[PDB]
Design a protein around this ligand. Structure first.
Ligand SMILES: *[C@@H]1O[C@H](CO)[C@@H](O[C@@H]2O[C@H](CO)[C@@H](O)[C@H](O)[C@H]2NC(C)=O)[C@H](O)[C@H]1NC(C)=O
Ligand SMILES: *[C@@H]1O[C@H](CO)[C@@H](O[C@@H]2O[C@H](CO)[C@@H](O)[C@H](O)[C@H]2NC(C)=O)[C@H](O)[C@H]1NC(C)=O
Ligand SMILES: *[C@@H]1O[C@H](CO)[C@@H](O[C@@H]2O[C@H](CO)[C@@H](O)[C@H](O)[C@H]2NC(C)=O)[C@H](O)[C@H]1NC(C)=O
Ligand SMILES: *[C@@H]1O[C@H](CO)[C@@H](O[C@@H]2O[C@H](CO)[C@@H](O)[C@H](O)[C@H]2NC(C)=O)[C@H](O)[C@H]1NC(C)=O
Ligand SMILES: *[C@@H]1O[C@H](CO)[C@@H](O[C@@H]2O[C@H](CO)[C@@H](O)[C@H](O)[C@H]2NC(C)=O)[C@H](O)[C@H]1NC(C)=O
Ligand SMILES: *[C@@H]1O[C@H](CO)[C@@H](O[C@@H]2O[C@H](CO)[C@@H](O)[C@H](O)[C@H]2NC(C)=O)[C@H](O)[C@H]1NC(C)=O
Ligand SMILES: *[C@@H]1O[C@H](CO)[C@@H](O[C@@H]2O[C@H](CO)[C@@H](O)[C@H](O)[C@H]2NC(C)=O)[C@H](O)[C@H]1NC(C)=O
Ligand code: NAG
Ligand code: NAG
Ligand code: NAG
Ligand code: NAG
Ligand code: NAG
Ligand code: NAG
Ligand code: NAG
Ligand code: NAG
Ligand code: NAG
Ligand code: NAG
Ligand code: NAG
Ligand code: NAG
Ligand code: NAG
Ligand code: NAG
Lengths: 414, 414, 414, 414
């Protein structure tokens, strides 16, 4: 009886072409998920900024996030367990949401990924009632609800996947105990049940579906849990027609370490897929006022492989979100979606493509494969993701690596 | 008392800039080497086309090659042992020089390389009297003498390295026995004694020198010998100032295997050296009428990584040779040099840069490092190689990847 | 409503101890299954020797088998489809009943497992009307009905498990097509919805039950299916109290492949369960006048780990069958049972415990778990299996590895 | 110009058979090695019990050991550097040798092996002057000179191998810094030159030789350093004629961790070598008054594998050293030799065969290999090791596992 719903958030002043595909709004889905839950809610988030004053800005668009916060407090009014795991080196330092929720009675246990693996807790997911889950790239932020284009999935009335996500969250929580040390081998309970070798089978809305999860870094991977890097390489290798991807940043290197090293695993996998199998490879990387200008040379190197004569297609584009009058809001107006679409599978993750997110920084990934069902009316998850990717690609907000019109509000060359 | 000298052959009608550095001509070196022989001569060659009419053309430029054959016959007139190892799939099918030598009393032997490992005997080297060696990419052909640019190195009075090369020559010779198979483990007879970690040390002309050899494929590499790919990777990694490489063909893919695959080992090593260590990388690729156009996209990728601001500088150029009134010579007017020079070593190879060369075909490389001696003397082999590379790079015959002049000669986009 | 019952065949002239547990006779269950058929019958078998003179023997003990064939023929007299899959290198090459059934109208496909995976179709299961199901270590042979002791399980009125085994039989049937090749990936139709971590739940006669299937080799194992080896290792590892096992042949080495190699997976699992978890281990191998004596030392290698002080308890015994006057029946009077019992689960398979049965030779097995329900009168299936194993263990026909004596029927080296 | 010679220590009152092979005494070899020391001595040892009063006994057999200390003190009288690394959980808690040496001007660092990975520093070797090396199974104890049979190898005048071992000693030394932690990746300074794939190649007294070094635990192995476990696995797999192994204790299980686990890697490799290749396997374990009885059944398992008719020959014996009058000395009269000789290689180790010695406890191992060369008269190292092993095997102190004669000073069943 498992149900799967693609959810997404279009920011303000971003109209789409007529007839373009759309999914459920993020705010409505989050409100419905919070209302449905009646036993307990477990959230794994990088940071918490749900109010305008938390950042230090005052704007009407924050209202939605504020409402969500109120709903959370309303959840505390019905005596519902609420456990939060957040990275010790969190981003928003002046936020006070966690203190208010703790005062209301919500347990919050900071997990120090900075001391253990020299990274951060980038995972973002919800497990409510042990029956419904949500997983996306959306932080617990009003910007992610109203000012940042975002994507994710929500699974309803599904038990085993909820149990697996609960296992991962329990690993995070156990690590969050004060004065903790990485175990050499995780206990029996933390072992994952579904892997890429034996994915979880289900009847989603009446159609077959094989879905599984993946975790990172390798230290936080219990027995039987696929690494998110391994899942990415698997969904790349199994491709035979095309590969579409959309990430916020793409560096084939190590970002924050010393000395920096070249990390070609994803780049090599993409090139091998494009060459050996002759699959159409498309990349759509978001851009904004805060993106690192040094990413572009690697993108140009990737696109230089294009050669229709020899059956190579590695087209690459940058997604541009106009800033408009929202210049006061920091770290906003960017495309934060991270996902991959294939004719066989579909990957939704919460980590960028860099050595840190697969070596040190924690993260989770979800792989879904929906075979066509008896009723052809219901489009598969792969088809919906591909349609969304095509809508993003054909839109005027995406430009080629050569298009550098002055009115684009991006760093470009720095 | 080893004496190592760099040798090279410049095709006619290819003048260089005034004051350009130059090495000893190849014809003189080969003539002197054949003149000094008094015990035996061993040669490993891909094909034999010394006679002008062999190919099917008549020209004055082949006269030099004829002389070489005469000298070989003169050797057969002085009771000098002569052994030849030739690949079973020879290129020049219409070859009669081997028949003439065999009739005179040679010891030719066809190595069934294609039957064994689906490759060819691309190794080309000379061992004279078990004391002198010659190693380069010049197959026995007058085109390499007068119509193809070529680089190599010869060593005099260096018995240890001569025996080391005799080891792999004996490997080829044993494999050349009719109805032979690849041994599971090579006997101690063919075991080497100098490798990358314990190179042959000596005083070359009063200058400290560490030199060693390589081999390929690993199936044909006996115990104690470094694979050519391993030597190339070591030379790339150990570099800290620059890497100047020149090859006729550069392919990060399997060349003739089916199905095609992506083999990024050399590409990954080059990118990692350029980025992590911040070393200047320059590549020079030969460009002739027979060059595969599909090679150009990959090169362009390596060119796109150039980011001078972020301490990542990679440059790629194509070296073309004007043809003019030299159209009747086939498979000529190409830059056949295959070598690499860093600030700490110098590698001279006889094989191109592709997966098949380092995994299926027979290839051999030589690595030489010359420390600055106490006496001023002249310049190290590294300095001479760097000077030759700079002269070629600054020449009018080397153009950028985007500099496709209409009056040029190479294939370019095909 | 699913009714799962165990069945076993007691060989003629093989009395048991007074007041010993038993189960439903195999012949009666097979007759009931053939009588209740109304739509179709699908059979997967290794060979067919229903008739007595099929193997060239004139004995009354074959009469029962003859009757079965008669019933089968009567089935084809009621316009009921009959699908049969047999191994191409089948034993008893003088088989004639298969030709008779094919002439009467039964579709027969000979799976070429010999040329496909270098194995044989050792799997023997049975599907009736897509609703009833049988599986045991009993070939369609008269001597397997009255001269040889085996054990199997038959489930009545269970649709989902019947359809899963129908999917496996459809895999075999598709492979039986002339000029067929191994599919690298399997269509969605050949996909099991019940695996080890997601078994089929049911209320068999009230008591809850979790049952799932396993198939081998992995080449013939479709997506979502559990490999036999995986199921065996899972049941061995899950056990915390005791492990009982009965297999005709036990070899930790490859049997028919070249060159012979060690395959210690099952040995290692048994030893680890015995030592690390302190699990009592009892093993019962079979004996026959045609048995490989080289199996015996390995069993002794298992027997030596019998230190009661260190909480390591491993016992191994052999089961002899008195030949009596039945010396004229080839390949008979052998313990054919292949099953395994723990305190929590029960595995019933159609494969021996060598390497080839899990890499090349096809086989099928079932893992069933029954927990006590509201009514404790009905003993769990694991308890019945343990009772049968204890009856066999205490039988006079079972002797330890030291109980060699005159008059035994084992090969006993030689 | 490297020289290799085996050196063994024969206990007091242990007369071997007349005309038996033998090598240099341990005490004289150590004294000569210390005399030849001129620059620095680096010693890695488990503990120090040089003097008799260290334990608290009064025996004349300690004389030699005390003299050794005197020699060491005389070394410190010549202003010679002396660095010693010992395990933090050392055995002899009363010894004052380290304190006396530190008073005289030594350099002692207590490596916190117990806290880093829950193990001990079982490695024992000497690096003298950076040119000579020694390594065996001898601790810095007088009990190791006149009361415990031991074996090791000493090498003179070999700079490369000495530097290779000095790299491991430097790893231990830097781990001995207070409050130090295990680095994620060891720097290039600790990278090993020679490993399994490219062993050091040299000429020992005119005999060609290949030799390398192996270290454990996996965590303390830098880049390019082969691990002891994989070294043993490869040496045993490459065997084709026989494998003669001698050790103190043989546990295919975890030794002192919790919970206990089965560790069959060495047992599986032994059985695979015995069966697949049909090699002759001989195992000789040393039993003393402190031997754990639980080892005996496991060995019996291997002895139960014997089957001459099937080309599977395995034999196991035990070595009993009579106590005689030497009953007051604790942990004495035990065969401490740990080595293994095959027809192609000879391995001399430091750690026993158990899980902890290859996962947590740190040890070092050497794999030498000599082939006939310019001095065929001189017996190779493997020949000498085989001769010593056969001398021990044929000695009256070697008793089969079935041998349970009274009066033997071995625990037996306990
Ligand atoms: C998840 O399960 C719940 C409980 O079965 C579903 O809630 C029911 O939905 C049906 C159809 O809309 C209603 O007629 C019932 O009244 C609902 N019951 C309750 C108690 O709310 C729900 O529809 C399922 N799917 C989701 C939540 O997406
Ligand atoms: C590039 O892809 C095209 C197909 O888009 C290939 O064209 C082939 O044409 C032959 C002619 O009969 C047919 O086998 C198919 O139409 C095509 N084959 C495949 C495998 O698609 C073309 O050969 C490809 N070029 C390459 C791989 O270099
Ligand atoms: C070495 O060279 C000499 C000089 O030519 C050879 O001598 C003559 O060689 C011819 C042809 O082989 C023979 O017919 C004569 O009989 C030889 N004369 C004498 C007196 O030797 C000699 O044969 C050569 N030896 C070889 C073949 O190595
Ligand atoms: C290699 O060694 C040979 C001798 O085996 C050298 O030849 C001699 O060189 C000296 C010095 O130039 C001359 O005086 C002798 O007349 C030479 N003798 C012969 C027989 O040639 C040679 O110079 C050395 N170096 C090389 C060949 O480069
Ligand atoms: C590129 O490399 C150069 C030298 O390798 C870097 O120059 C160093 O810059 C740092 C800080 O900017 C100084 O502390 C050093 O003294 C400089 N060293 C030298 C030799 O100039 C330069 O910073 C690098 N550029 C980047 C962007 O990393
Ligand atoms: C290691 O090398 C040294 C120096 O080559 C050897 O020392 C010499 O040994 C010879 C042989 O007895 C003596 O005649 C010399 O007087 C020694 N010279 C010095 C300076 O000591 C040393 O013997 C070699 N090692 C071994 C074990 O022989
Ligand atoms: C055990 O091995 C030996 C030798 O490995 C076998 O003896 C013969 O060895 C030769 C050597 O090439 C073979 O050609 C023969 O086929 C082997 N057998 C015979 C009967 O001569 C010996 O047979 C092996 N034992 C078994 C039981 O196979
Ligand atoms: C600025 O913030 C204040 C609260 O401090 C709020 O009352 C006011 O409306 C805000 N101004 C805006 C949103 O323009
Ligand atoms: C929540 O718990 C408090 C505890 O005192 C109780 O007073 C209140 O009624 C509870 N609210 C519920 C169950 O909705
Ligand atoms: C795992 O779960 C908890 C601890 O997280 C506890 O019951 C025990 O350690 C394990 N047991 C189970 C349920 O597997
Ligand atoms: C090639 O040389 C000249 C070309 O000028 C020509 O006259 C001659 O006949 C040719 N040689 C042969 C063998 O045909
Ligand atoms: C092998 O070595 C021996 C010993 O030196 C030698 O006599 C023989 O010629 C060698 N054979 C080959 C083919 O190298
Ligand atoms: C080609 O032309 C140049 C000058 O135009 C001349 O020097 C050269 O000799 C010609 N080549 C031949 C083979 O005649
Ligand atoms: C089988 O044996 C019975 C008993 O003697 C005999 O009557 C019958 O003819 C025999 N049949 C055959 C086919 O031998
Ligand atoms: C059953 O099969 C018989 C034999 O061919 C045939 O005559 C009869 O019509 C069939 N009945 C049905 C209902 O198909
Ligand atoms: C799979 O089943 C569907 C539904 O019955 C059917 O349409 C299709 O033909 C089947 N395909 C194969 C390969 O059996
Ligand atoms: C045949 O079997 C019966 C029953 O076991 C036995 O009484 C009789 O003596 C046997 N006869 C032979 C031929 O052994
Ligand atoms: C050791 O024993 C000897 C001989 O009995 C005795 O002279 C000496 O004093 C003893 N030493 C100690 C420390 O007991
Ligand atoms: C050691 O050094 C000290 C002072 O540095 C000096 O007094 C002594 O003589 C030296 N000993 C030797 C043996 O050189
Ligand atoms: C590595 O070794 C070099 C020279 O041997 C030395 O200068 C450097 O300090 C060393 N670094 C480390 C980290 O040991
Ligand atoms: C051991 O004691 C016996 C009996 O006193 C004696 O004969 C023998 O020599 C002693 N052995 C020694 C002291 O090594």
């Amino acid at each position: 009886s498992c149900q799967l719903v693609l959810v997404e958030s279009i920011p303000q002043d971003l109209p789409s072409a007529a007839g373009s595909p759309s999914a459920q709004p993020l705010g409505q889905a989050w409100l419905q998920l919070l209302d449905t839950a009646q036993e307990s809610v477990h959230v794994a988030s990088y940071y918490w900024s749900l109010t305008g004053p938390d950042i230090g800005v005052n704007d009407s668009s924050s209202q939605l996030g504020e409402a969500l916060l109120q709903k959370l407090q309303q959840l505390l009014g019905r005596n519902i367990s609420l456990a939060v795991a957040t990275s010790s080196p969190t981003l928003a330092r002046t936020s006070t949401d966690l203190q208010v929720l703790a005062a209301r009675g919500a347990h919050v246990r900071q997990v120090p990924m900075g001391r253990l693996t020299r990274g951060v807790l980038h995972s973002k997911f919800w497990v409510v009632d042990g029956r419904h889950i949500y997983m996306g790239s959306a932080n617990m932020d009003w910007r992610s609800l109203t000012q940042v284009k975002e994507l994710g999935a929500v699974i309803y009335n599904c038990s085993h996947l909820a149990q697996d996500l609960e296992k991962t969250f329990q690993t995070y929580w156990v690590l969050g105990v004060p004065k903790a040390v990485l175990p050499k081998t995780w206990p029996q309970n933390f072992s994952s049940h579904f892997n890429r070798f034996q994915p979880f089978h289900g009847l989603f809305d009446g159609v077959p579906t094989t879905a599984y999860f993946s975790a990172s870094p390798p230290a936080l991977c219990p027995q039987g849990r696929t690494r998110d890097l391994e899942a990415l390489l698997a969904v790349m290798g199994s491709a035979q027609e095309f590969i579409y991807a959309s990430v916020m940043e793409y560096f084939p290197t190590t970002r924050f370490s010393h000395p920096p090293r070249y990390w070609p695993v994803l780049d090599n996998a993409l090139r091998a897929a494009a060459f050996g199998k002759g699959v159409r490879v498309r990349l759509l990387v978001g851009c904004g006022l805060n993106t690192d200008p040094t990413m572009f040379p690697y993108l140009r190197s990737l696109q230089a492989l294009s050669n229709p004569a020899a059956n190579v297609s590695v087209d690459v584009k940058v997604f541009i979100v106009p800033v408009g009058n929202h210049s006061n809001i920091p770290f906003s107006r960017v495309n934060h979606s991270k996902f991959m679409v294939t004719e066989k599978a579909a990957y939704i993750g919460t980590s960028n493509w860099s050595e840190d997110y697969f070596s040190s920084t924690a993260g989770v990934g979800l792989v879904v494969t929906q075979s066509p069902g008896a009723q052809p009316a219901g489009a598969t998850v792969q088809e919906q993701l591909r349609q969304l990717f095509e809508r993003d690609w054909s839109s005027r907000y995406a430009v080629g690596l050569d298009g550098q019109a002055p009115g684009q509000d991006c760093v470009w060359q720095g």
